[PDB]
From a paper:
The apparently 53-kDa tumor suppressor and TF p53 is the most frequently mutated protein in human cancer.
For crystallographic analysis we used a p53 construct that includes the PRD and DBD (residues 62 to 292) and a C-terminal iASPP construct (residues 625 to 828). X-ray diffraction data were collected from microcrystals using a synchrotron light source and processed to 4.25-Å resolution, allowing structure determination of the complex by molecular replacement. Our final model includes p53 residues 91 to 291 with a coordinated zinc2+ ion and iASPP residues 657 to 823; the crystallographic asymmetric unit contains 1 such complex. Our structural and mutational data suggest that p53 H115 is a key residue mediating the p53–iASPP interaction. Overall, iASPP engages p53 on the edge of the DNA-binding site, and does not seem to clash directly with p53-bound DNA. However, the p53 L1 loop is displaced by iASPP such that K120 at its tip is no longer able to make contacts with the base at the second position of a quarter site. However, the p53–iASPP structure is distinct from the published p53–ASPP2 complex. A recent crystal structure determination showed that the HPV oncoprotein E6, in complex with an E6-associated protein (E6AP) peptide, interacts with the N-terminal arm and the LSH motif of p53 DBD. This HPV E6-binding site substantially overlaps where iASPP binds in our p53–iASPP structure, and there is considerable steric hindrance between iASPP and E6AP-bound E6 when the complexes are superimposed, based on p53.
Residue numbers in the entry:
A (entry chain B): 657 to 823
B (entry chain A): 91 to 291
The structure:
């Protein structure tokens, strides 16, 4: 609509779990941003809705995606004034840390990417990438990774813990 | 009813063919039909509704391969008890003409379905031929139906069950094995939602 709001976005804030699941399974873009840069994950977090967050994460949510307005991540949008804050924040915090560690360090590209530099790695949406070096202190925004034998740096915000739903 | 003298394995085993499972959700828009929870490894489904289970393999097993499904109680103390339909459901008029009235698990959409009451273990199971995925598909989908509610007195009576899926050759020898918990209920979406909330505690 005029506000960048999609069908998925509306179901989330209204806590209409049945519609959300249907849309996700149908291949609804779990990362579509509204006028303010809010993705479905950002809305779910602001409602502290852990169940929805999980469904989104498990279906290709960009954990490190940031909003246009305050440049915050979903984790940072959790509302400590509403119930369920602790549970949701904890889940998202654990989700962030599990990336490049769980599932044998494997993460899923959520977007096509053309390297800008030879020391960077190029990849297509949906491909599985192994994170070799996560916690490099000198670069909090990139990971050393491997795809089809090739090693290079990749942007953290281009990955999900799970892959997108293809239609 | 006689108790089994043994308990089938629920050990995950990908085998030489890299056999694993995948799941779908059947929910018709607002109506939450059958939903799977990755975090819980648990399927929530409605009685007699389509329950898609996906077979994923790394490479193709030989022709004549078969796929078997069997339910067991999840709790150690109930494991020897054969999972079967309650008196009410066993007697109700919901036959498809192929499945034994006592069997919990049916397969829909396959006229080569075969059912077994094991003479030795007493366990019920259902088996179909393995078919490779359709063109443009990455997996083989089997449509299961569960014919009794978790809450049925005289049946499961609120005791959790696991479904064990095995891949076998034409002779019955094991090729791969996987399993998942199952709750058959009236509102699978709500129950899944609720159980994940409680786990986070
Ligand atoms: Zn029953």
């Amino acid at each position: 609509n005029e506000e960048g709001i999609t069908a998925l976005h509306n179901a989330i804030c209204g806590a209409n779990y049945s519609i959300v699941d249907f849309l996700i399974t149908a291949g609804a873009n779990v990362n579509s941003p509204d006028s303010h840069g809010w993705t479905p994950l950002h809305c779910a977090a602001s409602c502290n809705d852990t169940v929805i967050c999980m469904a989104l994460v498990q279906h290709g949510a960009a954990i490190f995606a940031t909003t246009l307005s305050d440049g915050a991540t979903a984790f940072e949008k959790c509302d400590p004034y509403r119930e369920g804050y602790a549970d949701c924040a904890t889940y998202l915090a654990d989700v962030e840390q599990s990336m490049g560690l769980m599932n044998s360090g494997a993460v899923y590209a959520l977007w096509d990417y053309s390297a800008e530099f030879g020391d960077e790695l190029s990849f297509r949406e949906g491909e599985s990438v192994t994170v070799l070096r996560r916690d490099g202190p000198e670069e909090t925004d990139w990971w050393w990774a491997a795809l089809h034998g090739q090693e290079g740096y990749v942007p953290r915000n281009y990955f999900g813990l799970f892959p997108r739903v293809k239609p | 009813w006689p108790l089994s003298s043994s308990v089938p394995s629920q050990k995950t085993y990908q085998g030489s063919y890299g056999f694993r499972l995948g799941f779908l959700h059947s929910g018709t828009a607002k109506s939450v039909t059958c939903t799977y929870s990755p975090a819980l490894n648990k399927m929530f489904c409605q009685l007699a509704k389509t329950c898609p289970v996906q077979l994923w393999v790394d490479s193709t097993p030989p022709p004549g391969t078969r796929v078997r499904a069997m339910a067991i109680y999840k709790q150690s103390q109930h494991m020897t008890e054969v999972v079967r339909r309650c008196p009410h459901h066993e007697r109700c008029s919901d036959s498809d003409g192929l499945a034994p009235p006592q069997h919990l698990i049916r397969v829909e959409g396959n006229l080569r379905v075969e059912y077994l009451d094991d003479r030795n273990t007493f366990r019920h199971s259902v088996v179909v031929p393995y078919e490779p995925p359709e063109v443009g598909s990455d997996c083989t989908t089997i449509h299961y139906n569960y014919m009794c509610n978790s809450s049925c007195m005289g049946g499961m009576n609120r005791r959790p069950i696991l479904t064990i899926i095995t891949l076998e050759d034409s002779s019955g020898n094991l090729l791969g094995r996987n399993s998942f918990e199952v709750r058959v209920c009236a509102c699978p979406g709500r129950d899944r939602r609720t159980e994940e909330e409680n786990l986070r505690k």
